[PDB]
Design a protein around this ligand. Structure first.
Ligand SMILES: CN1CCc2cc(-c3cn4c(n3)CCC4)ccc21
Ligand SMILES: CN1CCc2cc(-c3cn4c(n3)CCC4)ccc21
Length: 305
C-alpha cells in the first residue's frame, strides 16, 4: 500500500482531565489509558467498550505500560512513584519508590521481569518486578527524562531528555554505551527503538522526528510537517500494514508518514486539543490517539491497509 486510509471508528470518553498515554495490550484485546485525573482506564481494543477503572495514585499519571503477557500494567505518576497493577483484579501489587520527583515514563522489558523508568529528577531507574526494588539508578541526564524504552531482547535501554541527548544503556551493567549528538541538540521529547532494534526514533521540540542508526550514530531519516514545540508526544512504528511513522501533533492532528520516503501519507482529523499520545495495534491496522485537557477523548481509527 502506498497510502493507508485510517478512518474514525470509536471515540472513548471517560477521563475528566487530559489523557497522557494510551497503549495496546500485547495480546491485542485491550487499550490502557492514563490521565491527569489520576486514573487508569481499560477499554476494548476492537469495540472501544469501556471495561474498568484502576485507581490508587495520589497525583496525575504520565505513562502506563503493559507486561508482555498482558496481565500487568505499570504506571508512572507525579506522586513520584510507579505502581505495578494486576489488571484482572485491579490490585496494586507493588509501589516502586525511589525517584525524588515526577515519574514521567515507564516500560517493561520483553521478559517483563524488569521495569525501566525516567523522571523529572533526571535519573533513569531499573526495577525488579517481583520484588519491587530498585536495582540500578543511572545518572542518565542533566535535565528531565522524557522517555525510556527497552530494545527487542531487553539488553539495551534508550533514554531521552530535555538536555538534548539520547543515550543507550546496557541493562545488565548500567553503563552508558552511546550518546547521540546531532549537529544541534534541541530538547528530545520522545525516543523508542525500532521493532528490529537497529534504529531509534527520536522526537525533538523543533517540530522534527528523526530515525537514527544509533550504532553508527547517524541520522537516516527526518520527518516534518507536524507541530511539536512544547509537549512530549509519543511516536510509533506502524508495521501491521504499510510501514509508517505515526505521531500526535500540537495542531490536534494525528500524522502518518511513509517511513522510507518521509512523505506525509495521512493526517487524521477529529481531536479538539493537542494529540499527546498515539499507539499502534500489534496485529490489526488500528491506531489509538488521545488528547489533552480541552478534548479529553481517546479515538480508535482503522485502515484497510
Ligand atoms: C497532562 N500532561 C500534559 C502533557 C503531557 C505529556 C506526557 C508524556 C509522558 N510521556 C510522553 N509524554 C512521551 C514519553 C512518556 C504525560 C502527561 C502530560
Ligand atoms: C520530560 N520533562 C520535560 C519538562 C517536564 C515537566 C513535568 C511536570 C509535570 N508536572 C509539572 N511539571 C507540574 C505539575 C505536574 C514532567 C516531566 C517533564
Amino acid at each position: 500500500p502506498v497510502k493507508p486510509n485510517y478512518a474514525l471508528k470509536f471515540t472513548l470518553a471517560g477521563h475528566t482531565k487530559a489523557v497522557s498515554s494510551v497503549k495496546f495490550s500485547p495480546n491485542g484485546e485491550w487499550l490502557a489509558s492514563s490521565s491527569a485525573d489520576k486514573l487508569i482506564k481499560i477499554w476494548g481494543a476492537y469495540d472501544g467498550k469501556f471495561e474498568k477503572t484502576i485507581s490508587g495514585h495520589k497525583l496525575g499519571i504520565s505513562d502506563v505500560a503493559w507486561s508482555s503477557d498482558s496481565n500487568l500494567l505499570v504506571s508512572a505518576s507525579d506522586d513520584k512513584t510507579l505502581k505495578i497493577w494486576d489488571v484482572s483484579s485491579g490490585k496494586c501489587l507493588k509501589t516502586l519508590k525511589g525517584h525524588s520527583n515526577y515519574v514521567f515514563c515507564c516500560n517493561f522489558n520483553p521478559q517483563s521481569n524488569l521495569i525501566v523508568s525516567g523522571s523529572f529528577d533526571e535519573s533513569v531507574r531499573i526495577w525488579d518486578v517481583k520484588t519491587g526494588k530498585c536495582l540500578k539508578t543511572l545518572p542518565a541526564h542533566s535535565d528531565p527524562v522524557s522517555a525510556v524504552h527497552f530494545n527487542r531482547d531487553g539488553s539495551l535501554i534508550v533514554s531521552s531528555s530535555y538536555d538534548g541527548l539520547c543515550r543507550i544503556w546496557d541493562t545488565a551493567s548500567g553503563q552508558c554505551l552511546k550518546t547521540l549528538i546531532d549537529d544541534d541538540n534541541p530538547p528530545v521529547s520522545f525516543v523508542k527503538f525500532s521493532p528490529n532494534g537497529k534504529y531509534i526514533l527520536a522526537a525533538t521540540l523543533d517540530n522534527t522526528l528523526k530515525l537514527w542508526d544509533y550504532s553508527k550514530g547517524k541520522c537516516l531519516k527526518t520527518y516534518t510537517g507536524h507541530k511539536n514545540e512544547k509537549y512530549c508526544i509519543f511516536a510509533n512504528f506502524s508495521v501491521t500494514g504499510g510501514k509508517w511513522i505515526v505521531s500526535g501533533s500540537e495542531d490536534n492532528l494525528v500524522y502518518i508518514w511513509n517511513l522510507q520516503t518521509k512523505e506525509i501519507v495521512q493526517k487524521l482529523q477529529g481531536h479538539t486539543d493537542v494529540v499527546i499520545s498515539t499507539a499502534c495495534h500489534p496485529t490489526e491496522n488500528i491506531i489509538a490517539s488521545a488528547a489533552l485537557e480541552n478534548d479529553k477523548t481517546i479515538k480508535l481509527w482503522k485502515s484497510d491497509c
